[PDB]
Amino acid sequence: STHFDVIVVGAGSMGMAAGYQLAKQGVKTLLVDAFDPPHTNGSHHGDTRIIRHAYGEGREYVPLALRSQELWYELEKETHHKIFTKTGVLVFGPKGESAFVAETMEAAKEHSLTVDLLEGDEINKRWPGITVPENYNAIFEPNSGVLFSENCIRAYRELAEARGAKVLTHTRVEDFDISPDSVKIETANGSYTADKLIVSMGAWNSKLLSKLNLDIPLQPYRQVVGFFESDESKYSNDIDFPGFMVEVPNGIYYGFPSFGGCGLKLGYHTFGQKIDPDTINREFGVYPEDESNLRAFLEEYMPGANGELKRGAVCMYTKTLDEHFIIDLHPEHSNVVIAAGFSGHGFKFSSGVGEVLSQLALTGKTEHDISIFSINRPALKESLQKT
Numbered sequence: 001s002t003h004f005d006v007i008v009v010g011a012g013s014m015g016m017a018a019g020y021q022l023a024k025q026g027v028k029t030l031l032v033d034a035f036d037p038p039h040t041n042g043s044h045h046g047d048t049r050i051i052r053h054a055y056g057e058g059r060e061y062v063p064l065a066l067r068s069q070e071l072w073y074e075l076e077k078e079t080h081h082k083i084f085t086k087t088g089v090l091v092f093g094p095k096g097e098s099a100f101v102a103e104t105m106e107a108a109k110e111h112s113l114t115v116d117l118l119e120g121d122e123i124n125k126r127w128p129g130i131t132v133p134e135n136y137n138a139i140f141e142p143n144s145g146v147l148f149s150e151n152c153i154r155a156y157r158e159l160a161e162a163r164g165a166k167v168l169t170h171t172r173v174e175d176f177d178i179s180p181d182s183v184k185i186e187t188a189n190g191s192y193t194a195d196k197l198i199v200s201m202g203a204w205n206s207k208l209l210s211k212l213n214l215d216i217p218l219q220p221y222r223q224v225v226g227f228f229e230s231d232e233s234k235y236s237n238d239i240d241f242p243g244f245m246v247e248v249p250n251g252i253y254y255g256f257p258s259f260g261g262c263g264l265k266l267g268y269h270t271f272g273q274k275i276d277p278d279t280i281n282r283e284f285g286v287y288p289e290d291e292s293n294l295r296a297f298l299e300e301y302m303p304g305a306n307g308e309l310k311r312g313a314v315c316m317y318t319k320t321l322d323e324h325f326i327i328d329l330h331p332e333h334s335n336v337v338i339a340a341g342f343s344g345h346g347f348k349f350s351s352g353v354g355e356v357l358s359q360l361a362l363t364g365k366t367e368h369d370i371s372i373f374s375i376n377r378p379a380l381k382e383s384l385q386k387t
Ligand SMILES: *Cc1cc2c(cc1C)nc1c(=O)[nH]c(=O)nc-1n2C[C@H](O)[C@H](O)[C@H](O)COP(=O)(O)OP(=O)(O)OC[C@H]1O[C@@H](n2cnc3c(N)ncnc32)[C@H](O)[C@@H]1O
Pocket: 009, 010, 011, 012, 013, 014, 015, 032, 033, 034, 035, 037, 041, 042, 043, 044, 046, 048, 049, 050, 051, 171, 172, 173, 174, 200, 201, 202, 203, 204, 205, 208, 223, 224, 225, 254, 267, 314, 315, 316, 317, 339, 340, 342, 343, 344, 345, 346, 347, 348, 349
């Protein structure tokens, strides 16, 4: 007998932030998750996430990144959980041969972001532990950094629940019944109704959006990260070793300084195994590339951070064809909001996206510019199943 104002399906990075934003405004909200967030079956574990501001992916991203940053600072003040550490983020690559580095520099210039430009040995000198060729250049953002992602979700959940949000765990939503004036979800633990629906199922959006009559190319990828024993005198956050995202000949890599001796963390961004979220092997090391692609980068660029493997994690990216997000109202139902395809780089924006989702669910519009995330854009190749 319990109707809600808004139901959020998938209470992870995006959904839990949305739940917090809704609860904060006195909106009767129900968040439903297949597990118990934060957990290790989706896209938010592995402890840390990079937040950068000079987003060359598209100008719309910078404002969202800056708003999210302010929102993370707000979250830091509201909870006892640690949210953000300002490690700074270093971006480097071969001079004149990296679109990623080039776009980053252009984005910083275009938005007047504070950054340091350096190249060659200046990089190796500023950060002992980094060894790049002399023909490499870099752009460093001193004011961006690292978010403790599980902590963020945990905090948003505690804050949302304190304000009345209900969270139904270990409950997989299996189907949807949408009406012009109400929404309804079906689960093994029962059916629930509300005036509005927010769908943010992460990797599972690739399998369940069809239940909403949507056909959108979304490919989940198995993405691992490893924590390695390192020279703490060089790679510790305490000696200001930065978070980083860089481009080398074989692709893009991202990493984090050692925090409290946990070891430098590294991930290979441009490669991953195509998988299904319900059959993915979540054990690190089952594929030789898991560990070898990481050490190949470390032995060449951060040689003192190539020690014993201390820990591994397996997580997922869900990509759209253009690698831009999907944040929009369902094309046939204005009372349904979709958040999907974050393509491996959405966590830093989750605070801002929660705000956008809240606005879309409550008003059908948002003050943020989200045109590049339109569910109707051509590059997405979106279509309805029944037309
Ligand atoms: C995996 C990964 C991602 C990543 C990264 C490193 C790795 C290894 N590094 C990042 C970084 O440095 N900076 C950044 O900005 N992003 C980075 N990412 C990407 C980011 O983690 C992802 O884009 C983000 O986490 C996506 O969030 P979203 O909310 O989409 O996904 P989720 O957190 O997995 O939450 C989805 C939830 O929905 C639930 N679920 C699924 N199906 C159902 C059904 N049927 N019913 C109910 N609930 C459902 C899940 O259980 C999950 O909690």
